[PDB]
């Protein structure tokens, strides 16, 4: 018997919006720790890793570890029926082949309950070796979205440069090339609309803007984003979910 009550249902709506376009079907790992989801896209070029700690729920209960295969498209259609201010509740009984979703309007006038048919497929398990990244970049989420959107008009690949000074975004195409240089904000501070660089070794990596434009669909989750890189190592785009967990995207770089 698994039941999880989340007061801020907008979190769950945004999460499916951040996966629907990149992953069509994924497996949900439910346990005492919380919710975990790991899946690569069809091309095996990118991977998403969702973690929702149980402590971030109003109510949490899990009598048995569950492995739920879920059509993310179907689940987003259902979550579309939920209001941003609704209290969402996920429920999965022991001998039930379906997932129950209960949306509760704020003023208790309206109560919705859904039931998606659910599926199961043989999926492979991987691991992410938690290593030391040569350069960690923390920057506003909106700004990173604008950059990845803008350079998509110049070219289809982006070269991220790392140094102690700042981070550089470059792209080239038929019409020309462009360089977006973000300086290490040291005199601004104020809100977390700042840019901080923690650089060890200079990093120079190239990535596909198509996949990055799928990652920035997680922008509504967090005001900021962190990018982690190393020498010939997949990129880590991390979106923090408010004191509940995170949503990390992994993306493979290229070499000749």
């Amino acid at each position: 018997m698994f039941e999880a009550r989340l007061v801020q249902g907008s979190i769950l709506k945004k999460v499916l919006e951040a996966l629907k376009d990149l992953i069509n079907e994924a497996c949900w790992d439910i346990s005492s720790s919380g919710v975990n989801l790991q899946s690569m896209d069809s091309s095996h070029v990118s991977l998403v890793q969702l973690t929702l700690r149980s402590e971030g729920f109003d109510t949490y209960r899990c009598d048995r570890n569950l492995a739920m295969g879920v059509n993310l498209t179907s689940m987003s259609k259902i979550l579309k029926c939920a209001g941003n201010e609704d209290i969402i509740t996920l429920r999965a009984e022991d001998n039930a082949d379906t997932l129950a979703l209960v949306f509760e309007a704020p003023n208790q006038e309206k109560v919705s309950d859904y039931e998606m048919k659910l599926m199961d497929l043989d999926v492979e398990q991987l691991g992410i070796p938690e290593q030391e990244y040569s350069c960690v970049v923390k920057m506003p989420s909106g700004e990173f979205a604008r950059i990845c959107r803008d350079l998509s008009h110049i070219g289809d690949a982006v070269v991220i440069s790392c140094a102690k000074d700042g981070v550089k975004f470059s792209a080239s195409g038929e019409l020309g090339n462009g360089n977006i240089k973000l300086s290490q904000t040291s005199n601004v501070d104020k809100e977390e609309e700042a840019v901080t660089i923690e650089m060890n070794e200079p990093v120079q990596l190239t990535f596909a803007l198509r996949y990055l434009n799928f990652f920035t669909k997680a922008t509504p989750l967090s005001s900021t984003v962190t990018l982690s890189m190393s020498a010939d190592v997949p990129l880590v785009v991390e979106y923090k979910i408010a004191d509940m967990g995170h949503l990390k995207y992994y993306l493979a770089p290229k070499i000749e």
Partner: protein, 145 residues
């Protein structure tokens, strides 16, 4: 994961700097997406020598053609397990009407400086015998099972 394919290099006489060759564009999604390559067709290994799928694909990119020159060359082994049989076709004139949207008849120099897959790089090598470019990687190399 074994994947069987078969490609063909359609060659035209052209004019100066010939001969000219046909090249289609890969889809914008998947592994090695967006690059140009010779017309290819995927098929099960149980039908790893069928000409129907190739000739049908060539008609979608060139129209009807007198099947009187389809010549086999060798085997292109691309490191899933991609097995591609390499063929060759030479025409005496120009295509039926024109190149449909998605095709480009480049020269030898125009092809030696464009963008293709590492598998197709070995395809053009077998054609000449009998006669900084980066590629997207896969997360399977970093996350073992």
């Amino acid at each position: 994961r074994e994947e069987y394919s078969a490609t063909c290099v359609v060659e035209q006489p052209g004019a100066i700097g010939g001969p000219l060759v046909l090249l289609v564009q890969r889809p914008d999604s998947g592994l090695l997406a967006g690059l140009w390559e010779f017309p290819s067709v995927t098929l099960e290994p149980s039908e790893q020598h069928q000409h129907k799928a190739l000739l049908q694909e060539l008609q979608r990119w060139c129209g009807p053609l007198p099947a009187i020159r389809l010549q086999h060359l060798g085997e292109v082994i691309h490191i899933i397990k991609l097995t591609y049989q390499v063929y060759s076709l030479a025409l005496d004139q120009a295509p039926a009407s024109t190149a449909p949207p998605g095709a480009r008849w480049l020269t030898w120099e125009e092809f030696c400086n464009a963008a293709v897959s590492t598998a197709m790089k070995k395809v053009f090598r077998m054609y000449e015998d009998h006669r900084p470019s980066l590629g997207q990687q896969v997360l399977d190399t970093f996350f073992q099972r």
